[PDB]
RNA sequence: GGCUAAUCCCCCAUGUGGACCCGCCCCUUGGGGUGUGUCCAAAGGGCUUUGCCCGCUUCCGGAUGGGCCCGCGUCCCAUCAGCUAGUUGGUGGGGUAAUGGCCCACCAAGGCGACGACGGGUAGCCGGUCUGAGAGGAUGGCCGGCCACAGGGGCACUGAGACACGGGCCCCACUCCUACGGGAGGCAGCAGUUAGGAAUCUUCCGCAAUGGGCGCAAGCCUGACGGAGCGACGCCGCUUGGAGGAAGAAGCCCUUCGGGGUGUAAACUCCUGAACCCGGGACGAAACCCCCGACGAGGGGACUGACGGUACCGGGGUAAUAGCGCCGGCCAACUCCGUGCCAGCAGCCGCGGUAAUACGGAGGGCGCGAGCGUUACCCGGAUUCACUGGGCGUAAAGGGCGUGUAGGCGGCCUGGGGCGUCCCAUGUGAAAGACCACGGCUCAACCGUGGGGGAGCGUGGGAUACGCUCAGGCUAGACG
């Protein structure tokens, strides 16, 4: 089995985008889906949808990129330049609202998991709560 | 308030006294990782009411003896040697790590 | 070549002897009482117990025993006497023992 | 200690004109006006491309040598500036400019800073009535710096304050040539000061 | 290492060892000169350098360099040593302080005088 | 017993006491139980004496014994004025 | 041996009350109440003397101070792995203000340890301090808190309190006295001596102030303290001058021998005028006390200064200390002469063997300035023990391989719990320090007042995504 399904996902995505895949499938879990929603809403992916690869539930994650480019190497810029796991089995990271980070002076996001559900570093700061710092994305 | 602790009775070879193993968890001060350390308490059991394998609450009390400042408050859940087991074994491995004999 | 507070040492010695004596009495009678009670002699044992009780409370008037020290002694005394008696029984002079 | 010694040689090394003499520094005898090259047996030789360090050193040495302040005092002011809120560079220049001995120079009670210093040490100055003889005393906005009454009849103060009739005074100050006094209106803004110094380089020198 | 590992063994702090067992950490130590030889520098250099075996109050005996143009240290001179090795003479790790006790200062010195115990040249 | 007295705090030639409640046995500049005022003997400023008279009265009500000088100061601030 | 007073000791009484035993009630570990029985009180002194003051006795409560107990935290070595018999627990005693193997009988055979027992090393701990962007590292001097000790070891007495630094007893080591039997003593109080050391002060002044002990008070005691003295040891402030002065004295140093440099620097001219001399001269000191009033509230009066004839104010008034390191690169500052792998320098790289900006001197220059250098030590740079923040194919680093214990880690869905986690309120987080502001010494150092913070921990309430746990389900992992 996978030891960390969220990191598995964050990477399937990190990988897929580096070779400009169209979409990418990841085994499904409510928690994973919950993270995609933030991912979608903040405009990092085009969105996702439940599908059934073989006989088991996955989540096509439609990736998104910038426009073709000039000079050598026309490959487009990435929407997801950076996506990294923070809390991990073996080293869970929890923060208080006063301790929620600020990814790239705001140009990026942190996805916390609170008792008020999965939120971004703002949705969390707004609702005045903290929790498990899941990852940062920019 | 008199501190209250919950734990497992791992020994009762004493008169009116049982040994309660109490675990606790916390973030390592420098490495964050939640680590789990534990400690044993000799609690007062005047009625010889508690048996090996009981998960009990323990309450800070007035000294009964040296090495004994707690009384069994109440039974949380009866029998469950799975816990007594870890302990017994974790202690048994001690033989296999010195210079004499033991078991792997 | 020194402090006239040597006086405290003189005083201490008298105070010491004064205490030592009050106590010796207490102990001696205390035993006497416990002994009589143990032997079933109720009227006799209680009679002496009261002296003991009285000497104890008195020792507490000043700084010999004072405190709950007297209380402790009176207690342990009346308990041993009341109990030793009950093993034959009959508290005659109903001295210090309450009904 | 406040230095004490050949001051024009300091102009020559910094390559710029500092007015450590008041008059004469406006006269064809300024030395800087006839020997703009560094002092010493090598002043006329080919300068070598200065090191990033040298540049910062020379720049700070220029600013400090202007106010005649000690590296010790100088450094303490800068640290105080660095602590306070707001652009350090400006705040630094404001503080340096709030030194009575300097303010006495700005109001023209003295021809030079080194002269205004002595005028303070010797009591010829006053702040709100009470006299002060501390060159480093810090003038605040609203204070009134005047000449000592007992001193208002000094050959030196006569000339100096006479020459003031007509001259203008910094936007942050305000002289009164008749009553021999003036006021510190507010901390000078960076713009008000026109020093041949890039305070930016100074802040960097102390960053090392 | 894994976090579990750092939790189990942790990092190990670096213990810095001295180059100047002038004991008590002390800034200086007093001693008496046993020998007052001369030594040959290593490979790159050549000369006759003035060293001095010294028995310290520190309860130690070690060679100490005798700086300056010329000295006056016999077999029983009272000397004060300080830290400071001499890269050329392996084994010499301290310097004698010229200007204290028996080791007189350097004469006709006019530059780095304080470093050689030579008082300010009299006269005007 | 416990007292209400002056603890020294200024500097050499610049004394500033603190009217204080403390155990009589403690050193004077030591751990006090409560500060209930301050006093500048050289009246260097218009505010050279302040006393929390509601508090002073409390301690006085529980045994606190003032120094003759402390009492003098407390009085000045109407601690005992019953008018 | 003899006499004698008392707020010295004792006896009887009175019993508000309180203590003890037994019972009952409430309460819940020995808390509060109630009943019978028993037991337990006291001291007088002064008067402005018959009415107040000071004091005495018992009890309940307050306040302050403290004992004991518990959770968590607190360095190095595993080249220390097993430790333990009062040891672990029980019953009954003893002991104490009080719990407790604290101690003692008797019974049980336990207790502790890789989550590091036991052993060895080192060390007073903390508020803080230094450093660092932070995390962290190092540290615990002054000041404030706690602990421990008072020549070394042990012990108890007295007392509210001590196992008592200037109290006592014994043993030991030492010094001194000794008519040799036997005695006396303990500066880790202030000051001082001596020894050790690289190195650390006056056998000072005062009790005026703050604080303390005793006293009704007057007042006495206080090497606590308030001051002064010595030492740039540190911090801050200040002076050795200011303005004018040559297309530029002399001397000295280079030179293309034209000239260039020290340099407006000097001499000079004028001005101010630190030091010093006069005159004045302080805050810190208003209480205690006395008088009126009621010994209260309130009002009135008197005494009192070590620092010190110091600070500071006024008058007069001289132009009058500058040094130390450095100049090959790092690193700001260059030339001549001297020396010739010598004498020497040197933090690292290195420099000197005939023309050395690196040795020594000189001229010049850079830096800093009553200081400047050196040594030593701590943090930094060093993401070079890497949590923030590192690595292991060939640079140092994969265990020779497997099996497997503990431990660490754990797929998808639902539910309960709510330990972790998160939120709110609340208590705690002394003062000093640190931060900000205003303010007092002419400024500042320093100091006062005020404000703002703060992690951690306790308590009450709440959330439930993730982790944990329990219960049920699944088949994508694993196994068959
Ligand atoms: K074992
Ligand atoms: K007595
Ligand atoms: K009270
Ligand atoms: K006699
Ligand atoms: K009764
Ligand atoms: K009481
Ligand atoms: K209490
Ligand atoms: K308490
Ligand atoms: K017992
Ligand atoms: K950090
Ligand atoms: K530390
Ligand atoms: K520490
Ligand atoms: K610390
Ligand atoms: K009194
Ligand atoms: K009055
Ligand atoms: K004067
Ligand atoms: K002069
Ligand atoms: K030559
Ligand atoms: K050569
Ligand atoms: K040279
Ligand atoms: K040279
Ligand atoms: K370092
Ligand atoms: K290998
Ligand atoms: K092997
Ligand atoms: K749930
Ligand atoms: K700090
Ligand atoms: K809390
Ligand atoms: Mg049992
Ligand atoms: Mg625990
Ligand atoms: Mg007496
Ligand atoms: Mg007898
Ligand atoms: Mg700033
Ligand atoms: Mg730096
Ligand atoms: Mg060589
Ligand atoms: Mg060195
Ligand atoms: Mg040199
Ligand atoms: Mg007789
Ligand atoms: Mg009664
Ligand atoms: Mg009762
Ligand atoms: Mg009763
Ligand atoms: Mg009767
Ligand atoms: Mg009676
Ligand atoms: Mg009378
Ligand atoms: Mg008992
Ligand atoms: Mg008891
Ligand atoms: Mg024991
Ligand atoms: Mg055993
Ligand atoms: Mg020690
Ligand atoms: Mg760092
Ligand atoms: Mg800092
Ligand atoms: Mg820090
Ligand atoms: Mg302290
Ligand atoms: Mg001694
Ligand atoms: Mg007493
Ligand atoms: Mg006693
Ligand atoms: Mg004593
Ligand atoms: Mg003691
Ligand atoms: Mg003594
Ligand atoms: Mg010596
Ligand atoms: Mg006094
Ligand atoms: Mg007094
Ligand atoms: Mg000339
Ligand atoms: Mg001049
Ligand atoms: Mg004058
Ligand atoms: Mg004149
Ligand atoms: Mg008096
Ligand atoms: Mg009268
Ligand atoms: Mg009257
Ligand atoms: Mg009055
Ligand atoms: Mg250079
Ligand atoms: Mg030659
Ligand atoms: Mg030679
Ligand atoms: Mg040469
Ligand atoms: Mg050169
Ligand atoms: Mg050099
Ligand atoms: Mg580091
Ligand atoms: Mg790391
Ligand atoms: Mg590396
Ligand atoms: Mg290798
Ligand atoms: Mg291999
Ligand atoms: Mg395996
Ligand atoms: Mg396993
Ligand atoms: Mg799971
Ligand atoms: Mg598990
Ligand atoms: Mg919870
Ligand atoms: Mg809080
Ligand atoms: Mg505080
Ligand atoms: Mg001010
Ligand atoms: Mg404050
Ligand atoms: Mg907080
Ligand atoms: Mg809570
Ligand atoms: Mg719930
Ligand atoms: Mg659950
Ligand atoms: Mg299941
Ligand atoms: Zn000029």
UniProtKB/Swiss-Prot annotation, chain A:
Protein name: Small ribosomal subunit protein uS8
MF terms (GO), sorted A to Z: rRNA binding; structural constituent of ribosome
GO-annotated cellular components: ribonucleoprotein complex; ribosome
Protein origin, superkingdom: Bacteria
Gene symbol of the encoding locus: rpsH
A Pfam family it matches: Ribosomal_S8
Keyword RNA-binding applies: yes
PANTHER family linked to this entry: 40S RIBOSOMAL PROTEIN S15A
Record note on quaternary structure: Part of the 30S ribosomal subunit. Contacts proteins S2, S5 and S12.
Protein family per UniProt: Belongs to the universal ribosomal protein uS8 family.
Single GO biological process annotation from the record: translation
Species for this entry: Thermus thermophilus (strain ATCC 27634 / DSM 579 / HB8)
Function as written in the Swiss-Prot or TrEMBL entry: One of the primary rRNA binding proteins, it binds directly to 16S rRNA where it helps nucleate assembly of the platform of the 30S subunit central domain. The combined cluster of proteins S8, S12 and S17 appears to hold together the shoulder and platform of the 30S subunit.
UniProtKB/Swiss-Prot annotation, chain B:
Pfam families xrefs: Ribosomal_S17
Domain of life: Bacteria
Key word Ribosomal protein present: yes
Presence of keyword rRNA-binding: yes
One term of GO molecular function: rRNA binding
UniProt xrefs under InterPro entries: NA-bd_OB-fold (IPR012340), Ribosomal_uS17 (IPR000266), Ribosomal_uS17_bact/chlr (IPR019984), Ribosomal_uS17_CS (IPR019979)
Single biological process term from Gene Ontology: translation
GO cellular component, one term: cytosolic small ribosomal subunit
Keywords: Ribonucleoprotein, Ribosomal protein, RNA-binding, rRNA-binding
SUPFAM superfamilies assigned: Nucleic acid-binding proteins (SSF50249)
Function: One of the primary rRNA binding proteins, it binds specifically to the 5'-end of 16S ribosomal RNA.
Similarity annotation: Belongs to the universal ribosomal protein uS17 family.
NCBIfam families from the UniProt entry: PRK05610.1, uS17_bact
Protein name per the record: Small ribosomal subunit protein uS17
Organism whose genome encodes this protein: Thermus thermophilus
Encoding gene (name): rpsQ
UniProtKB/Swiss-Prot annotation, chain D:
GO cellular component entries: small ribosomal subunit
Swiss-Prot/TrEMBL cofactor(s): Zn(2+); [4Fe-4S] cluster
An MF annotation (GO) of this entry: structural constituent of ribosome
CDD domains per the UniProt record, alphabetical: S4
GO terms of biological process kind: ribosomal small subunit biogenesis; translation
Residues binding Zn(2+): 8, 11, 25, 30
InterPro entries attached to this UniProt entry: Ribosomal_uS4 (IPR022801), Ribosomal_uS4_bac-type (IPR005709), Ribosomal_uS4_CS (IPR018079), Ribosomal_uS4_N (IPR001912), S4_RNA-bd (IPR002942), S4_RNA-bd_sf (IPR036986)
One Pfam family it belongs to: Ribosomal_S4
Start and end residues of each S4 RNA-binding domain: 98-160
Cofactor mode of binding and number, as noted: Binds 1 zinc ion per subunit. In a number of structures (e.g. 4Y4O, 5FDV) a 4Fe-4S cluster is seen in place of the zinc cofactor.
Methyltransferase as UniProt keyword: no
Keywords assigned: Metal-binding, Ribonucleoprotein, Ribosomal protein, RNA-binding, rRNA-binding, Zinc
Subunit structure: Part of the 30S ribosomal subunit. Contacts protein S5. The interaction surface between S4 and S5 is involved in control of translational fidelity.
PANTHER family named among the record's database cross-references: 30S 40S RIBOSOMAL PROTEIN, SMALL RIBOSOMAL SUBUNIT PROTEIN US4M
NCBIfam families recorded: PRK05327.1, rpsD_bact
Family annotation (HAMAP family): Ribosomal_uS4_B
Function text: One of the primary rRNA binding proteins, it binds directly to 16S rRNA where it helps nucleate assembly of the body and platform of the 30S subunit. Binds mRNA in the 70S ribosome, positioning it for translation.
Protein family membership: Belongs to the universal ribosomal protein uS4 family.
Protein name: Small ribosomal subunit protein uS4
Lineage per the UniProt record: Bacteria, Thermotogati, Deinococcota, Deinococci, Thermales
Swiss-Prot record, chain F:
UniProt keyword terms in alphabetical order: Ribonucleoprotein, Ribosomal protein
Taxonomic superkingdom: Bacteria
Gene3D superfamilies in the record: 3.30.1320.10
A matching Pfam family: Ribosomal_S16
Any single GO CC term annotated in Swiss-Prot or TrEMBL for this entry: cytoplasm
GO molecular function terms noted in the UniProt entry: structural constituent of ribosome
One of the protein's GO biological processes: translation
InterPro entries documented for this protein: Ribosomal_bS16, Ribosomal_bS16_dom_sf
Function according to Swiss-Prot or TrEMBL: Binds to the lower part of the body of the 30S subunit, where it stabilizes two of its domains.
Oligomer and partners: Part of the 30S ribosomal subunit.
Family to which this protein belongs: Belongs to the bacterial ribosomal protein bS16 family.
NCBIfam families in the record: S16
The protein, known as: Small ribosomal subunit protein bS16
Source species of the chain: Thermus thermophilus (strain ATCC 27634 / DSM 579 / HB8)
């Amino acid at each position: 089995m996978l030891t960390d399904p969220i990191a598995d996902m964050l990477t399937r995505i990190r990988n897929a985008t580096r070779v400009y895949k169209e979409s990418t499938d990841v085994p499904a879990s409510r928690f994973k889906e919950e993270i995609l929603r933030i991912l979608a809403r903040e405009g990092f992916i085009k969105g996702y949808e439940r599908v059934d690869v073989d006989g088991k539930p996955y989540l096509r994650v439609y990736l998104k990129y910038g426009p073709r480019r000039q000079g050598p190497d026309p490959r487009p810029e990435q929407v997801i330049h950076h996506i990294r796991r923070i809390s991990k089995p073996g080293r869970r990271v929890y923060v208080g609202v006063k301790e929620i980070p600020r990814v790239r002076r705001g140009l990026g996001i942190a996805i916390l998991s609170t008792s008020k559900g999965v939120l971004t570093d703002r949705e969390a700061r707004k609702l005045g709560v903290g929790g498990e710092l899941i990852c940062e994305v920019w | 308030p008199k501190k209250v602790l919950t734990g497992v009775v791992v020994s009762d070879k004493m008169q009116k006294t049982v040994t309660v193993l109490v675990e606790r968890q916390f973030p390592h001060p420098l490495y964050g990782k939640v680590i789990k350390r534990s400690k044993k308490y000799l609690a007062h059991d005047p009625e010889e009411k508690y048996k090996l394998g009981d998960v009990v609450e323990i309450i800070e009390s007035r000294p009964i003896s040296k090495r004994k400042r707690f009384r069994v408050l109440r039974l949380v859940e009866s029998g469950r040697m799975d816990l007594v087991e870890k302990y017994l074994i974790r202690r048994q491995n001690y033989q296999s790590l010195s210079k004499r004999g033991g078991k792997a | 070549r020194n402090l006239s507070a040597l006086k405290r040492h003189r005083q201490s010695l008298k105070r010491r002897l004064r205490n030592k004596a009050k106590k010796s009495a207490i102990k001696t009678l205390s035993k006497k009482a416990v002994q009589l009670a143990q032997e079933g002699k109720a009227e006799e044992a209680l009679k002496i117990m009261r002296k003991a009780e009285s000497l104890i409370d008195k020792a507490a008037k000043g700084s010999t025993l004072h405190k709950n020290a007297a209380a402790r002694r009176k207690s342990r005394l009346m308990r041993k006497v009341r109990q030793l008696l009950e093993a034959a029984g009959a508290p005659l002079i109903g001295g210090g023992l309450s009904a | 200690g406040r230095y004490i010694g050949p001051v024009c040689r300091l102009c020559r090394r910094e390559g710029v004109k500092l007015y450590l003499k008041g008059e004469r520094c406006y006269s064809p005898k300024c030395a800087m006006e006839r020997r703009p090259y560094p002092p010493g047996q090598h002043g006329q030789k080919r300068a070598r491309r200065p090191s990033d360090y040298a540049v910062r050193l020379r720049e700070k040495q220029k600013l400090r040598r202007i106010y005649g302040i000690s590296e010790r005092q100088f450094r303490n002011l800068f640290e105080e500036a660095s602590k306070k809120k707001g652009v350090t560079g400006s705040v630094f220049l404001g503080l340096l400019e709030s030194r009575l001995d300097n303010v006495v120079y700005r109001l023209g009670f003295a021809v030079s800073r080194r002269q205004a210093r002595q005028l303070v040490r010797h009591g010829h100055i006053t702040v709100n009535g009470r006299r002060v003889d501390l060159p480093s005393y810090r003038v605040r906005p609203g204070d009134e710096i005047a000449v000592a009454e007992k001193s208002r009849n000094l050959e030196l103060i006569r000339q100096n304050l006479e020459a003031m009739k007509g001259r203008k005074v910094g936007p942050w100050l305000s002289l009164d040539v008749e009553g021999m006094k003036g006021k510190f209106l507010r901390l000078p803004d960076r713009e008000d000061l026109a020093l041949p110094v890039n305070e930016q380089l100074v802040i960097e020198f102390y960053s090392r | 290492p894994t976090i579990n590992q750092l939790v189990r063994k942790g990092r190990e702090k670096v213990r810095k060892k001295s180059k100047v067992p002038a004991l008590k950490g002390a800034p200086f130590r007093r001693g008496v000169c046993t020998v007052v030889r001369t030594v040959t520098p290593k490979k790159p250099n050549s000369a006759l350098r003035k060293v001095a075996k010294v028995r310290l109050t520190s309860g130690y005996e070690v060679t100490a360099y005798i700086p300056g143009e010329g000295h006056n240290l016999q077999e029983h001179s009272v000397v004060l040593i300080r830290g400071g090795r001499v890269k050329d003479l392996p084994g010499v790790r301290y310097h004698i302080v010229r200007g204290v006790y028996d080791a007189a200062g350097v004469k006709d010195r006019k530059k780095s005088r304080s470093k050689y115990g030579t008082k300010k040249p009299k006269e005007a | 017993m416990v007292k209400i007295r002056l603890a020294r705090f200024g500097s050499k030639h610049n004394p500033h006491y603190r009217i204080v409640v403390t155990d009589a046995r403690r050193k004077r500049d030591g751990k006090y139980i409560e500060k209930i005022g301050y006093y500048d003997p050289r009246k260097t400023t218009p505010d050279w004496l302040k006393v929390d008279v509601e508090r002073a009265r409390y301690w006085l009500s529980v045994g606190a014994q003032p120094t003759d000088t402390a009492r003098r100061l407390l009085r000045q601030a109407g601690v005992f004025r019953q008018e």
